[model samples]
Target: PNFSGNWKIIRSENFEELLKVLGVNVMLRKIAVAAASKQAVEIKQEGDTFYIKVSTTVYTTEINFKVGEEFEEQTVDGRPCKSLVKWESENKMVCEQKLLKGEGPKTSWTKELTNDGELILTMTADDVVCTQVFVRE
Candidate 1:
């Protein structure tokens, strides 16, 4: 995982915008954004076994998955809906979320290394895309 760094949401404004496109509620969106801004992720991987922990000042959450396995996941907070997620490429996780009838949203996570040593996380949920930038100090 090696996810030790200071990261900030540079695009999509905040998590609410990302969920708004996914049809999330105003109240839940407010809570999620407030929580997500204070959230921090600590990840560690060993022999294809991945451990991920997401924590905020108020709450903490954790989830795990293997390299080439599909699992049911909750794409947004405060939503009881779950979706199937599969690994698309190396270090690139793609979650196929069925948000509606006859169609679904795909969120792909990938790392982009900038020349200035900034790591960017690009989250594309259908046409709406957001970016999280991280700097290792």
Candidate 2:
């Protein structure tokens, strides 16, 4: 529950080729790499519900959902995602995502909790793996 403060990215062990799998252009991927490591996140939890804000100099996105509920999300990158997230354990959260509106290619994203107790988000779709680690402030 204390995961509700601004957090800096100390490192990302899995994000190099992530954007390319998401069909991001080379320029956007470069920008993503530059921005991902400098962003911070704020999450507020009230019972089973959560409101999250991911902020950076280049972009900012807000998300709201309750565990076990499915919701529509438009990420900071302007991708429309139909998402479902649930707490797998006390310290682990898992997310499953699918693109709702698009004609380029079908894509999916997933975020898994890491073993280090860090909020490590992972996405694998279209044969690409993107990971991010978040530290609590």
Candidate 3:
């Protein structure tokens, strides 16, 4: 039941545009687009706490929180949000994020590990939906 591993992103759909919809500026968006294909993520779960680290050529982000507890987080564009995560099943998790300001809509995402050990992330913001596929490294 441990969800600790290193995952490398192999494919993404509508990711750049999703960033646009999230109000990322031109410079950051360009950097993100160039680094999207080379992103790697590490996840660790200890007891009820989970840690996520995302690394790319441009920037790195780290998040640590306990399951079922609300925490504060900042998006890539530096927007603050209240976030919570919960398990949907043994290998499935869902995260809810509510923006602190009125600039954007509330967002939610589902992360599921497939039978073949692939990680799939389905994210939604307003009417935009983006999917990111990752393979365990």
Candidate 4:
């Protein structure tokens, strides 16, 4: 399936660990992740540009980007980062995020769709790996 539709997260592995990677506000993040509609994502692709919207029960974030183009994003917690999205293969893609003006460990996430039509999100930060699986809506 193409990654150009609405997707909802079904289950997450090492979610808390993923939050720990942020290491900013644990309780608030926990509440946001645990209370939402289980984290819904909407994506639209046009040529080489992509629009991605991630929404939780408490927050919604929109990120639009073009392949290989570095863009800056300001996180909910007021942290700024520069990011780049690139295709690793036909069915796999990755996004790299680097802090724009702070000293922190860089992070990256990879996405791949399974034959079962499941979208799997794998996040890496500070040597930790977290995975989240999404289902098409």
Candidate 5:
């Protein structure tokens, strides 16, 4: 499955726990998942090169990465990190993001399209997990 289209997040789960493990303060975490948040993601894939644009009501940012190559990024919770993305097989993609300061466990994102054609993004920070479901737009 080629993930080279716009995706709209329909629902999320356990996002607060992920924010907590990402070093977000309590006040912000309380506000982060307050609403039934909606976000738009645009993805472009060209061979091993990939670009992703993400937007919420308050902010928007885009990043580019090459599979098997390390890149720098700032997490949505404002954590600076280095990341590497890889294609696990034909259908699954995985990313490993390590905090720049080396204080906590590395964060991960595993993405795959389900049989129902929904995009499932599973993110993990330490023991906390956050999952988001997206549909093609």
Candidate 6:
């Protein structure tokens, strides 16, 4: 349950709807969809502190957060938020994001490891949901 290894994205489901809910424009959505297939992630956990790195065709992003602590986060698409992360269980992590612009709805992200040892990331923006699956690299 210690997420301290490289992960490679295998596939995604309903991600375009998530991008639309986040207010990304059509051109960007096309680009994002095209690039999503090549995404990779690296995670390191030291006690309660977590470091997550995401690499994509368009850009790479990394973030650091501690369990049950609030921090300012600028999303890869440039959306700013006050974010907090907590562990729901040994293999499950949750994040809540409050948008700083006050226009978009609050978002929640959940990461869980499946019984088959696959990493599943779920994102909810308003009514839209996106799920991405990753395997240990």
Instruction: Point to the candidate with the largest lDDT.
Output: 6
lDDT per residue (tens digit) for residues 66-99 in model 5: 8899999976566788999999887678999888
Clashes of each: 0, 1, 0, 1, 0, 0
- Which lDDT values do the candidates have, in the order given? 0.57, 0.68, 0.82, 0.78, 0.83, 0.85
Q: For residues 11-129, what per-residue lDDT tens digits would candidate 2 score against the true structure?
A: 76446575565567888778777878787878777876879888888778888988889999864346888888877776567777767876433444443345564666665555666
TM-score-based ranking, best first?
6, 5, 3, 4, 2, 1
TM-score of each: 0.64, 0.79, 0.87, 0.86, 0.89, 0.92
Residue pairs clashing in model 6 are none
Which candidate leads in TM-score?
6
Of the pair 4 and 6, which is ahead by lDDT? Answer: 6
lDDT of 1 by residue, 1-137 (tens): 34434444333354567778878789988887776666565666675665666567877666676655655445553333334445444444544444433444555445454666555665566677766665653
Better of 4 and 6 by TM-score: 6
Worst 10 residues of 1 by lDDT: 76-85
**Candidate number that wins on lDDT, 5 or 6:** 6
| lDDT head-to-head 1 vs 6, winner | 6
Cα error, residue 35 of model 3, in Å, equals 1.4
lDDT of 3 by residue, 100-128 (tens): 88767557777788888888887777788
What tens digits encode model 4's per-residue C-alpha lDDT throughout 1-137?
38788999888877677667768577876775575437888989787688989887767889889889999875334478888888988768898888888776667778787878888888777787878889999
- Summing lDDT over every window of 10 consecutive residues in candidate 2, give the lowest-scoring window: 104-113
Candidates in order: C-alpha RMSD to true structure = 4.2, 2.7, 1.9, 2.2, 1.8, 1.4
Clashing pairs in 3: none
Residue pairs in collision within model 1: none
**Candidate 4: segments with Cα more than 4 A from true spot:** 74-78
- Deviation from native of the Cα of residue 123 in model 1, angstroms: 3.1
